[PDB]
Symmetry: D2
Subunit: 262 residues, 4 copies
C-alpha cells in the first residue's frame, strides 16, 4: 500500500539508504539528492576513486553520513558482504536502491551467450542476492526496495536483447515477491522504476548515432525514483513525454493479478 501523501525531502532525513551503481549517471544523482535530504548513504560501484569523490560531495551536500564500498556486482559474495557492511556503517537499512547494470551498448544479438549470462548475473541475480541480504534489516525498519528498470524492461526493443531479458526478469521476480509480501504481511515496499531516455553520459554515448530522441534530465529522474520509493509506490514511470508513461501502464495485467488474489 502506497502512502497517500505528498512527497517531502524530509521523508529521507536520517534514513539509511544503499545506492548501487552510484559512481555516475542516475545512481550518482540519487546519492546527491539523498545527501541533500540528510540521509545516511552507502554508495557502491567498481570505481573506487570516483566513489570517494561522490562520498566527499555527499558529505558537502549535508549527508548524515556517507561511505562507499567498491566492488563488482558480478561477485555474489561481494554483494552479500557489501550489504552486511553497509548495514553496519549506517546501523540499519531503510531503503535499498538497486540501480547498477553491466556495460550495455546497442548491438544485434550474435551468439553472445557470455553477454546474456553476464547481464543476467549483474543486472538481475545480484539484485536478488542484495535483496536477500538486505531483507532482515528492511523488515526491521519496514523499509523499501527500489528496483531501477527500463522501457526495455516492459516492452521489446532490438539491440538490447540480453539487457531486456535481465530487466524483464526483475519485473517478474520483484512483482511476484511483492505479491508474496502482501499475503505474508511483510511490511517492505517494492518500487519498480521504468525509465525512458535519460541524459546520462552512458545513454548519450550509446544512442549516438542510432536513436535521436529527447533525453530527460538525470537529476530529475533520480529525484522521481527516490520519490516513488519514499511514497512506497509499486511503479515509477519517468520519461520526457507524459504520453509515454500512459503507454507503460498495464491495467489488463493489474486486473488479472487482482482476479487471482481474490
Amino acid at each position: 500500500q502506497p502512502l497517500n501523501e505528498e512527497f517531502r525531502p524530509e521523508m529521507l532525513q536520517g534514513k539509511k539508504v544503499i545506492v548501487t551503481g552510484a559512481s555516475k549517471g542516475i545512481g550518482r544523482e540519487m546519492a546527491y539528492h539523498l545527501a541533500k535530504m540528510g540521509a545516511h548513504v552507502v554508495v557502491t560501484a567498481r570505481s573506487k576513486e570516483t566513489l570517494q569523490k561522490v562520498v566527499s560531495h555527499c558529505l558537502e551536500l549535508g549527508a548524515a553520513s556517507a561511505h562507499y564500498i567498491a566492488g563488482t556486482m558480478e561477485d555474489m559474495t561481494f554483494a552479500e558482504q557489501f550489504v552486511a557492511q553497509a548495514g553496519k556503517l549506517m546501523g540499519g537499512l531503510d531503503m535499498l536502491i538497486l540501480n547498477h547494470i553491466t556495460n550495455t551498448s546497442l548491438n544485434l544479438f550474435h551468439d553472445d551467450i557470455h553477454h546474456v549470462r553476464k547481464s543476467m548475473e549483474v543486472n538481475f541475480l545480484s539484485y536478488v542476492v542484495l535483496t536477500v541480504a538486505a531483507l532482515p534489516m528492511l523488515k526491521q525498519s519496514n523499509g523499501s526496495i527500489v528496483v531501477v528498470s527500463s522501457l526495455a524492461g516492459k516492452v521489446a526493443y532490438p539491440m538490447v536483447a540480453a539487457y531486456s531479458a535481465s530487466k524483464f526478469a526483475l519485473d517478474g521476480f520483484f512483482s511476484s515477491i511483492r505479491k508474496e509480501y502482501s499475503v505474508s504481511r511483510v511490511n517492505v515496499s517494492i518500487t519498480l522504476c521504468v525509465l525512458g531516455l535519460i541524459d546520462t553520459e552512458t545513454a548519450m554515448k550509446a544512442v549516438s548515432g542510432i536513436v535521436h530522441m529527447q533525453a530527460a534530465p538525470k537529476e530529475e529522474c533520480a529525484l522521481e525514483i527516490i520519490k516513488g520509493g519514499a511514497l512506497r509506490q509499486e511503479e515509477v514511470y519517468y520519461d520526457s513525454s507524459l504520453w509515454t508513461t500512459l503507454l507503460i501502464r498495464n491495467p489488463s495485467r493489474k486486473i488479472l493479478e487482482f482476479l487471482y488474489s481474490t
Copy 2:
C-alpha cells in the same frame, strides 16, 4: 509476419522438429501431435526410459522419424551438443520447440537464490544456448522457434517468483531478437506461447489444495502451440477462459514498439 491462411496438419509433414521437455506433459503431447502429422521429431528430457516410450509411440502414430537424446538442460554443453546431434539425425531443422522447465512448485520465496539461479539457467539460459546452436539450421530452412511460456511470464503471481523471473526473461529476450530478425531480414519466426492452467500431471499436483481453477486439456494446448508456430504467429494464448486471452494482450506495448519502429 504470420502466414495469412488457416492451419493444415500437412504444414508439419516432413518437417524437422525438436521438442524439449517431451517425456511428459505438454511436451509429450506436442511430440505426439507432430508424429500424427508425419513430422521428423527429436525429443529430449533427462529420463531415457520415458523418452524411449515417447519415441516408440511417435513411430506408432506415424512419425517420419523419431529419436531421443537424454540429458539435463542444466548442462549448457549438453544443450549445444544436443542441437547439433538432433540436426545431424534429421538432416536439418525446421522448428525448435523450447518447452522444458526445471522442477517448480508453489512456495514463498524464502531466500532461495539456488532456485532462482537454477530456474534462470534451465528455463531461460538453456533456451538461448539452444537457439544459438539451432539458428544456422533454422536460417537455412526459414524455420521457427517456439518458446513455451506462461501467464506467470506476463503477469505477477505469488509463489512462483524464480519461475516468473525466468519466463519474463524469455519474453524480453525472444521478443527483442524477433525485432532484430525483422530489421536484419532473418526469416526465422519466433512464437511465444502464454499458457494458463493446463491439466498436466505436474500442474494438477502443484495446484492441489492451493488453486481451484478449471484446467485446460494438455492435448489441445499442445496442438494450439504447434498451430501458432506453424503459422508463424508472434504470440499464442491458451487458457480455458477466452477472457484471459483478452487480458494478456498488451496493445500499449505493441504501440510503443511500433513507434520505436
Copy 3:
C-alpha cells in the same frame, strides 16, 4: 470542476431543486431524498394525483417546502413556463434534475416514426428547453444541471432504438455545452448520470427473466444522482455491477476532448 469534498446531506439543506418525472421511480426517490435533506422541492409529471402523494410525503420527510406543477413535457411551452413558475415560487433555483422520459417499452423498431419523434421531443428537446429556461437562475446561484441518462445512452441495445437516440442526444448536447460553459466561465455544473438496471416499477415490468435480480435499488440510485450533482461531478455511473461501471468509462473520448480543449 468537481468539489474536492465528501458529500454531506447538509449540502442540500435549503437548496432550491426541481425534479422532473418525479411522481414515481427514481424521480420520486430523488424528491424524497431531497425532502429528507431539507431542500425546497418542486416536482413535476403529468399526473396531479400521483404528484400530490409525492408532495405530501416530502413534507412529512421534512422538506423546507414541497410543491408540484403538473403537465406534459411534450409541450415546450409548459416546459418553459414550468421552470419560471417553479423558480418564482422557490425564489430561485440551485439544481435542475432532468429525469422524465416518455413511456418506453422494449419493442423492435417498426416504422413508428411518431415514437422516434416523441422520444426526441420528450426525452431530449424538453431537457434543452428546461435548461434554457433555468439557466439565468442557475447562473445566479452557481447551480447545477443533472441529466439522467442510461446505459442505452452510451452503448447500443436492440428494442430501445428511439430511446437510445434520445439519450445519446443528451450526451452529445449536454457534454458540448459543458465544454462551452468551461470556456465561457459559466459557473453551472452539468452532471450526466449513466444508469444500469434500476428496480423501478417501469423497469421491472419492462425487463424479462433473471436480469430482474441484478436490478439496483432505486433509493440508492436516487441518492447517488443527487450526490454527483451536489459534488458537481461530470458523470455519475450507477449499476449493480462494478465491472459494468468499468466498461462505460471512455478514457479515449476524454483524451480526444482534452487534446481539442487547447486547439
Copy 4:
C-alpha cells in the same frame, strides 16, 4: 457480418445508390466515385442548380444512370417520397447513403431551440424517415445503409452542441437497429462513418480563424465511405491522423454489447 474480401470498384457496378446532401462536399465526391464505378445514382439536396451540375459530371464519368431530385429534408413528406421516386428511377435500391446536414457553424449555444430542433429534424429524423422508406427495397437487394457521422458524433466539442446531439442520436438509433437486424435476421448492413476534418468548402469556411489542423481530402474520404459501405463494415473511421482513428474506437462499448448479446 462484413464481406471477407478486398474492395473492388466492380462491387458498385450496376448498383442502385441514393446519395443525400450530394450537391457539394463529401456527398458530391461520393456521387462522382459511384459514377466512375458505373453505378446508378440518384442525388439529392435543396439546390437543383448544383445538383444538375453533379448529374452532368456523373454521366460524363460513366454512371449507368444519374438523376437528381431537389428538396429539403426538413420536409418528412419529401424525404419519404424522394426514396420512392429514386427507387422508381433506378428500378430498386442497393445502397442508401445518408449524408446531408442542415447548415451548421461554430457558435456558443444561446437559447436557439429553433436551431436544435431543426438540427434534430434534418440531421437525424430525416435519416430515420429515409431509412423506413428505403428498407423494403434494401431488404429485397440485401442492401446497405451508410450513415455519415462525425467525431462530434462520438465525442463532445464546444460550439457544435445542436449538431453533436443530432450525430450522437444517429449512433444511438442506427447502432440499435443494427442489433435488431442481427436478431431479426434482416440482411441489410448499417455502416456508421466517423469523420475528422475533411477539406469540404463548408468545413474550410467553418474552421477559418478558429481551428488550425490538417484537413483530409474529400475525394479519398468519399471513397473510404463507399468502400466501408460496400464491404458491409459496421463503422468507417476517416481522419488525417491514424492515431485519431485509434482514439475513436470504443472496445469497452463493444464488450458491453457483446455481453448483452450473450
